[PDB]
Amino acid sequence: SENVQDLLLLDVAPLSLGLETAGGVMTALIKRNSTIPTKQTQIFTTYSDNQPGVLIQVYEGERAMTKDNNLLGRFELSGIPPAPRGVPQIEVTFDIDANGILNVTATDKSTGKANKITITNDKGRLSKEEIERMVQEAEKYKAEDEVQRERVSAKNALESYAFNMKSAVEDEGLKGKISEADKKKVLDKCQEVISWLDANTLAEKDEFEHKRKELEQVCNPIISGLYQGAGGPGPGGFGAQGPKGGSGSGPTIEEVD
């Protein structure tokens, strides 16, 4: 079901075979799922002028910039007349036969010299599992690689020294030598066309839930109590006696004797 196999049918290119072309451009001439014998003849030029020898190197997979992919083989075509940019015409005939042998012929139209390589795709690098992953990643990040790849567009070309680990010159500015610059560079956000980023305008939507209680009863204490006020008496027994009657100043009634 997921597996469907019998015989025949898979008489196609399992990989997308490409070349390192311009500096940062992988051109896949024979793309996967294309029935073999396949062929693609494309004429390339060099931006890199005055190069008497160019490097044709075959990679499998797809990336924007030629790296992170598999390498089948390479060959260096010498004979190219040291001419300006876009002048050397390299005819590259890239074809796979019925066995699955990729033959890449680079023919310099300028001189007439041709060098080819014969590579069977029956055998390969890695085991295969990694290659399948590589293809899947190439599909997966394809959109990203497409934009990246097509950002380096002008003309089909092959670049020699297409990796600046150490650049030739990169400080020609007016500094000590000619200290009068003021401004000779006016733009940055101009000259090169502006692209718009894709705004993904979608908002979220929430959900909540909150259902559980701990207070089962509502206890409301009511006053329920009585009392009795007790009272008592007091001993009110008071009375001041004053016996009198027959006491005082008592002379002999008649004075002296």
Swiss-Prot record:
Region Substrate-binding domain (SBD): start and end of each range?
10-125
Q: How is it modified after translation?
A: Acetylation enhances its chaperone activity and also determines whether it will function as a chaperone for protein refolding or degradation by controlling its binding to co-chaperones HOPX and STUB1. The acetylated form and the non-acetylated form bind to HOPX and STUB1 respectively. Acetylation also protects cells against various types of cellular stress.
Per the record, residues carrying Omega-N-methylarginine are: 85
* Region of interest: Disordered: 230-257
Which residues does the record list as N6,N6-dimethyllysine (modified residue)?
A: 177
Q: Where in the cell is it found?
A: Cytoplasm; Nucleus; Cytoplasm, Cytoskeleton, Microtubule organizing center, Centrosome; Secreted
**What happens on changing residue 177 to R?**
Complete loss of in vitro methylation by METTL21A
From start to end residue, where is composition biased (Gly residues)? 230-249
Question: What parts of the sequence cross the membrane?
Answer: none
- Tree of life domain: Eukaryota
Q: Residues bearing Phosphoserine?
A: 247, 249
Which residues are annotated with the PTM Phosphothreonine?
A: 252
As stated in the Swiss-Prot or TrEMBL entry, residues carrying the post-translational modification N6,N6,N6-trimethyllysine are 177
What induces or represses expression of this protein, per its UniProt record? Answer: By heat shock.
User: What's the record's remark on domains?
Assistant: The N-terminal nucleotide binding domain (NBD) (also known as the ATPase domain) is responsible for binding and hydrolyzing ATP. The C-terminal substrate-binding domain (SBD) (also known as peptide-binding domain) binds to the client/substrate proteins. The two domains are allosterically coupled so that, when ATP is bound to the NBD, the SBD binds relatively weakly to clients. When ADP is bound in the NBD, a conformational change enhances the affinity of the SBD for client proteins.
The subunit structure is: Component of the CatSper complex. Identified in a IGF2BP1-dependent mRNP granule complex containing untranslated mRNAs. Interacts with CHCHD3, DNAJC7, IRAK1BP1, PPP5C and TSC2. Interacts with TERT; the interaction occurs in the absence of the RNA component, TERC, and dissociates once the TERT complex has formed. Interacts with TRIM5 (via B30.2/SPRY domain). Interacts with METTL21A. Interacts with DNAAF2. Interacts with PRKN. Interacts with FOXP3. Interacts with NOD2; the interaction enhances NOD2 stability. Interacts with DNAJC9 (via J domain).
Please name the disease the record associates with this protein: In certain aggressive cases of activated B cell-like diffuse large B-cell lymphoma (ABC-DLBCL), plays a role in the cytoplasmic sequestration of misfolded N-terminal mutated PRDM1 proteins, promotes their association with SYNV1/HRD1 and degradation through the SYNV1-proteasome pathway. HSPA1A inhibition restores PRDM1 nuclear localization and transcriptional activity in lymphoma cell lines and suppresses growth in xenografts.
Q: Which family does it belong to?
A: Belongs to the heat shock protein 70 family.
Function of the molecule: Molecular chaperone implicated in a wide variety of cellular processes, including protection of the proteome from stress, folding and transport of newly synthesized polypeptides, activation of proteolysis of misfolded proteins and the formation and dissociation of protein complexes. Plays a pivotal role in the protein quality control system, ensuring the correct folding of proteins, the re-folding of misfolded proteins and controlling the targeting of proteins for subsequent degradation. This is achieved through cycles of ATP binding, ATP hydrolysis and ADP release, mediated by co-chaperones. (Microbial infection) In case of rotavirus A infection, serves as a post-attachment receptor for the virus to facilitate entry into the cell.
Put simply, this protein is called: Heat shock 70 kDa protein 1A
Q: Which gene encodes it?
A: HSPA1A
Q: Which residues of the full protein are shown?
A: 385 to 641 of 641
